[PDB]
Write a protein that binds this ligand. Structure first.
Ligand code: X3W
Length: 900
């Protein structure tokens, strides 16, 4: 047991709460999750010891590869006849003397071939399966047989015109360093009648007894508002209790609902709230799953602790809110009573559902012309015309925020069998289902059961708040299991972690998929841990995320120990910054720095703040902290500028110092999402041969309004440039930094990165640009920082241009010409914008879905589908492609007072 106790201390330190608190949770769902999730843990551990040591090395150091080995024409043209120059370093003599070997090989060469060529060059100077290639300066390895150019490091080197520097390491040098972890099963591994829902011939009714902890200001009259929901879709009309004074919240009233108990869908929920009053106002709210995790209908007495109303929610009910009782018991508590049927009621099995769907399909197949004429949801098989097929195809092209009329819904449902031939229509077909009809739902189940697979980015939509059904969500997860690459999983990890909150139960297919991937890929596992840990202060998700983190920490292996180093380093940094903002806030920079350096030099702190992996990128080792290079930044919330040595043997070939900005006080979640979207945008542009280089620098939220920002070396704000001022200062600075022949490359890089940031900021509705949030690298790469604001943040009770190209920017674009607006350079720059704008337009659904998946997150500027609709306005989705280009030009023309 000594091993178990110690490991529980390690897991508790990682999660930020003791494991014993989980053991005390009475709720059977919680204890069943803890026990049953362990098979995902076992499965993942089995996959890792399948082909050991190689399979273990693949888990710890997965290949950091692109999704496809194909190169866009513009990237291939950067290669000398499809060949790349590569530098291979062999550490040999004592005191680690470095021998370099320059190779000109095909871009498609496998690491083993690269090693053979290196051995050839070293032998000419006077086995291949005994070495591995490592990226110089960081812990990135090439353990798998992918073409060299498919490795992200290599592709980046090709794209940026950089020399790839790789190090020949012995297989045994790496293998001996990966410890053998023996995953142990925890102590908790060792643990009337029953009627079907469809045999309950009764209407729904729920009793509202009384409310406790209704502490309000003498508010002069209150009631309970209730409704039956399927996602955010009401299943019947809302039912309110009679009004009562808040001084005595007693109702003892059965509420009768307009729904037959057998018609209740699987994901049906009771959404309620205590309202005051005419200006009706919600005081507290709470949601409940009408069926528990065991598929049992709610029976008996239940007490539900309510949640405080979130600012901006005028609506009396909160359906897209969290389901379950508030963990804090010193909150308004509502007592409810459910119906009793003298037996346990369960949701029918798939076999019963299938028998019923086949019975319905067969019955409908025999319907006469006139019977089918009774309903617009009924359509005879052979009546399917080509015009109808064309209408179905047109509907499937519409964006997820485009309204589907009641007529289109009846249309889609009656043609559901033809819909299988155009499988991407599934999200529209599902919103057209009468979720309060068991006859229709049973048939939808069977259609989904055998539904053709759709793209992972299309399936992701089916995991958002509009799709609560577990059969639907199960199909989505299966598409991800079959077609989502680890690369794309990493890219969309924030969205996939968010959509976990929309799950009715702790144990589901999505969490099993995500956990298995985190436990079989340490790069995925790293960010999985941090995304969950960053939200552990949020009581809406702390039990879910806490239980998930416990399962992750039991099976991740040795990485727990490394994570605990990063957790301890962040904890010390939160502690220091918290003191500086509450105890030393008014003191000078010189004084504050003296306190900081004295605190940091304490042996306990000094050890905790050095020799750990960067949470921004775990391939980066943070060695000794360079205190003399550290500083308190004069910016808002006084962030810490931190500098560590990169202890890697060949750090000089990557970077010798790792500089990170630690910030305590601002919410960094909107920045992370924007930075992710900028990268996705750049990826779309690059694939279409549209070379607009963006700078989606690293940003990670590690807690409540705490996080890390990746520093971009040799980059300066426009204000830093002009504060050496004329409009020619910037262009003169770039000319000075790019003297000679290389000048044109800087102007091209500037105009290209400028076009990208113009289009990206206009689409996304980012916070207003100024000379302190626009940065420029010495080579001419323009980029933006501080993405705290996006979408419709300047809304009133209509669209903006956040990046207005002042004379300074146009002078650079036009190479110093006076009439910068009327030059061929500016005409070429406009063309880059138009193409960039239209390309994003073609991928609008992806962007709409990425934002829709982030709705359950507590982001201030992303609270409703109305906020996402801003992107539907900027992309001009209701207009044609030419009208959309015209609208963009007009927005640009108005903001710049001419030119477009
Ligand atoms: C104060 C800080 C938190 C700001 C505000 O919100 C951001 O997003 N910020 C940010 C991002 N980046 C940098 N600031 C940054 C700052 C300075 C430097 N540089 C590098 C050279 C010296 C220093 C400078 N220009 O002062 C480089 C940076 O990288 C881009 C990411």
């Amino acid at each position: 047991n000594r091993e178990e106790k110690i490991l529980n201390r390690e897991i508790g330190f990682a999660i930020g709460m003791p494991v014993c608190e989980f053991d005390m949770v009475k709720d059977p769902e919680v204890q069943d999750f803890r026990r049953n999730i362990l098979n995902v843990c076992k499965e993942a551990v089995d996959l890792r010891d399948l082909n050991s040591p190689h399979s273990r090395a693949m888990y710890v150091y997965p290949p950091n590869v692109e999704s496809s080995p194909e190169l866009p024409k513009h990237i291939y043209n950067k290669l000398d006849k499809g060949q790349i120059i590569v530098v291979i370093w062999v550490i040999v003599s004592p005191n680690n003397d470095k021998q370099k070997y320059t190779l000109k090989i095909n871009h498609d060469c496998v690491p083993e071939q690269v090693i053979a060529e290196a051995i050839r060059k070293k032998t000419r100077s006077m086995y291949q399966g005994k070495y591995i290639l490592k990226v110089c300066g960081c812990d990135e390895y090439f353990l798998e047989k992918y073409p060299l150019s498919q490795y992200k490091y290599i592709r980046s080197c090709i794209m940026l015109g950089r020399m790839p520097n790789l190090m020949l390491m012995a297989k045994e040098s790496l293998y001996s360093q990966l410890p053998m972890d023996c995953f142990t099963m925890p102590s908790y591994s060792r643990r009337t009648s029953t009627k079907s829902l469809w045999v309950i011939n009764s209407a729904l009714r729920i009793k509202i007894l009384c409310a406790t902890y209704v502490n309000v200001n003498i508010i002069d009259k209150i009631y309970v508002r209730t409704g039956i929901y399927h996602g955010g879709e009401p299943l019947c009309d809302n039912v309110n209790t009679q009004r009562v004074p808040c001084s005595n919240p007693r109702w003892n009233e059965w509420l009768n609902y307009d729904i037959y108990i057998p018609d209740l869908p699987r994901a049906a929920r009771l959404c309620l709230s205590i309202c005051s009053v005419e200006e009706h106002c919600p005081l507290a709210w709470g949601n409940i799953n009408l069926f528990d995790y065991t598929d049992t209908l709610v029976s008996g007495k239940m007490a539900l602790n309510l949640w405080p109303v979130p600012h901006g929610l005028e609506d009396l009910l909160n359906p897209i809110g969290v389901t379950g009782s508030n963990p804090n018991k010193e909150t308004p508590c509502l007592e409810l009573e459910f119906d009793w049927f003298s037996s346990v009621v369960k949701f029918p099995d798939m076999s019963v559902i299938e028998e019923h769907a086949n019975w319905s399909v067969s019955r409908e197949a025999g319907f006469s012309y006139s019977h089918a004429g009774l309903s617009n949801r009924l359509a005879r098989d052979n009546e399917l015309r080509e015009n109808d097929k064309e209408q179905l195809k047109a509907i499937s092209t519409r964006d997820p925020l485009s309204e589907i009329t009641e007529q289109e819904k009846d249309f889609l449902w009656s043609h559901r069998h033809y819909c299988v031939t155009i499988p991407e229509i599934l999200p529209k077909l599902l919103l057209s289902v009468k979720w309060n009809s068991r006859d229709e739902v049973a048939q939808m189940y069977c259609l989904v059961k055998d539904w053709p697979p759709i793209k992972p980015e299309q399936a992701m939509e089916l995991l958002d708040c509009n799709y609560p059904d577990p059969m639907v969500r199960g199909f989505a997860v299966r598409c991800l299991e079959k077609y989502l690459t680890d690369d794309k999983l990493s890219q969309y990890l924030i969205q996939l972690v968010q959509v976990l909150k929309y799950e009715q139960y702790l144990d589901n297919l999505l969490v099993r998929f995500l956990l298995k991937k985190a436990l079989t890929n340490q790069r995925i596992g790293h960010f999985f841990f941090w995304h969950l840990k960053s939200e552990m202060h949020n009581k809406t998700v702390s039990q879910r995320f806490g239980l998930l983190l416990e399962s992750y920490c039991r099976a991740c292996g040795m990485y727990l120990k490394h994570l605990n180093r990063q957790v301890e380093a962040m904890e010390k940094l939160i502690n220091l910054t918290d003191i500086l903002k509450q105890e030393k806030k008014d003191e000078t920079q010189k004084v504050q720095m003296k306190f900081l350096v004295e605190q940091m030099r304490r042996p306990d702190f000094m050890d905790a703040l050095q020799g750990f992996l960067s949470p921004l990128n775990p391939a980066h080792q943070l060695g000794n902290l360079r205190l003399e290079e550290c500083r308190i930044m004069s910016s808002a919330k006084r962030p810490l500028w931190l500098n560590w040595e990169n202890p890697d043997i060949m750090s000089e070939l990557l970077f010798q110092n790792n500089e990170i900005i630690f910030k305590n006080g601002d919410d960094l979640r909107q920045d992370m999402l924007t930075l992710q979207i900028i990268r996705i945008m750049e990826n779309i542009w690059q694939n279409q041969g549209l070379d607009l280089r963006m700078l989606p620098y690293g940003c990670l939220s590690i807690g409540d309004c705490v996080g890390l920002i990746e520093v971009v070396r040799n980059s300066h704000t426009i204000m830093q440039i002009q504060c050496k001022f004329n409009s020619h200062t910037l262009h003169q600075w770039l000319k000075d930094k790019n003297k000679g022949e290389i000048y044109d490359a800087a102007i091209d890089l500037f105009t290209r990165s400028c076009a990208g940031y113009c289009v990206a900021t206009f689409i996304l509705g980012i916070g207003d640009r100024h000379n302190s949030n626009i940065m420029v690298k010495d080579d001419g790469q323009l980029f933006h920082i501080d993405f705290g604001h996006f979408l419709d943040h300047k809304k009133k009770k209509r669209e903006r241009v956040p990046f207005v190209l002042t004379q300074d920017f146009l002078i650079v674009i036009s190479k110093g010409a006076q009439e910068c607006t009327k030059t061929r350079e500016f005409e070429r720059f406009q063309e880059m914008c138009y193409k960039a704008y239209l390309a994003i337009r073609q991928h609008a659904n992806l962007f709409i879905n990425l934002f829709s998946m982030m709705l359950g997150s507590g982001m201030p500027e992303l609270q409703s589908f109305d906020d996402i609709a801003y992107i539907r306005k900027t992309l001009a989705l209701d207009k044609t492609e030419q009208e959309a280009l015209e609208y963009f030009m007009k927005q640009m023309n108005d903001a710049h007072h001419g030119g477009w």
